[PDB]
């Protein structure tokens, strides 16, 4: 159950955008939005 969450451009609010849906924020109304960091094991070697 992953509705694919995005982050608005200027508002920096979370939005739930599913397939076959417009890419806009729940408020204001922009056309830019980024994704959220993955949930994988981002491990680095301080080298």
């Amino acid at each position: 159950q992953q509705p694919m969450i995005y982050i608005c451009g200027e508002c920096h609010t979370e939005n739930e955008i599913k397939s076959r849906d417009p890419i806009r924020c729940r408020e204001c109304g922009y056309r830019i939005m980024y994704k959220k960091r993955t949930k994988r094991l981002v491990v680095f070697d301080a080298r």
Binding site: H12, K18, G29
Partner: protein, 160 residues
């Protein structure tokens, strides 16, 4: 109908109402379910949803903020309420018996089991409703109507 487990199915919790603060067909998809509105000490009273009304007082509910109340009624007593007082607890046995007694005293015929069964699917089919029409514009308009502009990363845009 005489069980609380089957009645709690259409119980609109406080977390679900946050996703239909500005979705159309509100009066058609909400009118019919029951909520555990808090009166206040820990006693609760289930009431029927008769319609929808907009109150002149604006209040913030966690992250979002709305000014739409909920015209409820418990047998005969009716008055204006708000969506912030609704609790997430289920209909206990005592509250269920109290609601049944209130309904029997008011005379309103209790809903039917098949009615509840065919109404509970309304919220399910509305949750997964694709936003393909032109409702996002109305949603953002109704939001910005109350959400003040300066906040926050659009100060330059507002000045321009």
């Amino acid at each position: 109908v005489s069980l609380p487990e089957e009645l709690n199915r259409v119980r609109l919790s406080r977390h679900k109402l946050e996703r239909w603060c500005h979705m159309p067909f509100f009066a058609k998809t909400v009118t019919g379910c029951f909520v555990r509105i808090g009166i206040g000490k820990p006693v609760y009273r289930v009431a029927e949803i008769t319609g929808v009304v907009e109150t002149a007082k604006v209040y913030q509910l966690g992250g979002t903020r709305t000014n739409k109340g909920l015209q409820l009624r418990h047998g005969n007593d009716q008055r204006v309420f708000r969506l912030e007082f609704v609790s997430n607890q289920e209909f206990t046995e005592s509250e269920f018996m109290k609601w049944k007694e209130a309904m029997f005293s008011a005379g309103m015929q209790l809903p039917t089991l098949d009615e509840i069964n065919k109404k509970e699917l309304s919220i399910k089919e509305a949750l997964n409703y694709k936003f393909n029409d032109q409702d996002i514009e109305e949603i953002v308009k109704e939001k910005e109507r109350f959400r003040k502009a300066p906040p926050n990363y659009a100060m330059k845009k507002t000045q321009l």
